[PDB]
């Protein structure tokens, strides 16, 4: 289940995104709620620090902006 993909405390954000999208590929869900899972569920399940940074970026942030912003974690 996609709701079980949570970024580990040491896990790099790129690997977490990879697992999140891999499990995202099998999820049985409409394309709008999959867009909500990419935009919002990904942020909610990140580890604490990278979650703080990702929330700080506000709305509309791309996956590349999100990956650059968390590279200091």
């Amino acid at each position, epitope marked *: 289940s996609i709701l079980d993909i949570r970024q580990g405390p040491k896990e790099p954000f790129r690997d977490y995104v990879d697992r999140f999208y891999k499990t995202l590929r099998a999820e049985q869900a409409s394309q709008e709620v999959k867009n909500w899972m990419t935009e919002t569920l990904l942020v909610q399940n990140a580890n604490p620090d990278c979650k*703080t*940074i990702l929330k*700080a970026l*506000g*709305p509309g942030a791309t996956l590349e*902006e999100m990956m*650059t912003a968390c590279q*200091g*974690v």
Partner: nanobody
Amino acid sequence: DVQLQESGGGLVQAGGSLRLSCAASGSISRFNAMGWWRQAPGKEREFVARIVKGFDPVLADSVKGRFTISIDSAENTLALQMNRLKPEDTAVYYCFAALDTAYWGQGTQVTVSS
């Protein structure tokens, strides 16, 4: 460790201009992202501007025509220049910086009034 302090806030007339500045400890090129949020009484934190390292600045739709976000590496400061200010712009403004976590200043008050 990471220190941020906003400044440049005050009281201005409608249609005026103001320049907020966020002082950071160390060099600003070390941060992977910085930006600006604002909060008005009773309203939840609103996103204003963001700059992520290597990327173009993104600004909110309510500010896009009037505000600019910049980085001054000489003064180690993050600037938000606000122009054509409106009463809706009255709020406390916070800068944030992204390193190992997100760090925030405590904010500066910006007041637009007649």
